[PDB]
Ligand binder design. Sequence first.
Ligand SMILES: *[C@H]1c2c(ccc3c2OCO3)-c2ccc3cc4c(cc3c2N1C)OCO4
Ligand SMILES: *[C@H]1c2c(ccc3c2OCO3)-c2ccc3cc4c(cc3c2N1C)OCO4
Ligand SMILES: [Ca+2]
Ligand SMILES: [Ca+2]
Ligand SMILES: [Ca+2]
Ligand SMILES: [Ca+2]
Lengths: 90, 90
Amino acid sequence: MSELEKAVVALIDVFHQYSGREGDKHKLKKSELKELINNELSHFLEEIKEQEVVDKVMETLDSDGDGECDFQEFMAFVAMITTACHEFFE
Amino acid sequence: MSELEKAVVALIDVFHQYSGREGDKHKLKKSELKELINNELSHFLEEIKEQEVVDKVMETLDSDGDGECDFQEFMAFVAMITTACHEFFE
Ligand SMILES: *[C@H]1c2c(ccc3c2OCO3)-c2ccc3cc4c(cc3c2N1C)OCO4
Ligand SMILES: *[C@H]1c2c(ccc3c2OCO3)-c2ccc3cc4c(cc3c2N1C)OCO4
Ligand SMILES: [Ca+2]
Ligand SMILES: [Ca+2]
Ligand SMILES: [Ca+2]
Ligand SMILES: [Ca+2]
């Protein structure tokens, strides 16, 4: 497999490390999204310590309105937190 | 860095390896998208040998209608072609 295919499989793996913990095993509820951001995105985002901050993050990404982050919405979230990076690649 | 972060950076890096070849350096035109799929996604997708297949993939990815695949749209494309994987992580 290519570097790209290995990165995609790695992305899916970590998403499931969090979505599979509670309730719907294929979506992140707020407590799972909080842990993923704090444990795994520490270079891209500030640690979340307040409930109101997690609420807003979820509200900003939850495009279909079900209260949870599915894989499609997570992938869009990954794109949003990378916006500043592209200029450095060009 | 975390496994997720390394994977995200790898995804951005391969996108730009193709998007930076011609024209808009931050989007994939049809030629760049075909090249990326054929060279980097050969486990997830069949080799593209027909113009109709390229046209259809671009049409399906291109949510803003500019004829090119930007990074957000690429993240959505990655999520689409990996749907069969998820059941292996629960
Ligand atoms: C984006 C970026 C990265 C890490 C953390 C971040 C952001 O935006 C805010 O939080 C990141 C990681 C790695 C690279 C590697 C290379 C880039 C840009 C990167 C970023 N950008 C700065 O350009 C070439 O290699
Ligand atoms: C997703 C899958 C893989 C290769 C080609 C594919 C798909 O779906 C459409 O075409 C793939 C590669 C690697 C892994 C690794 C592990 C998974 C699932 C994978 C897949 N699925 C089947 O679960 C645990 O590790
Ligand atoms: Ca869950
Ligand atoms: Ca949702
Ligand atoms: Ca281009
Ligand atoms: Ca587009």
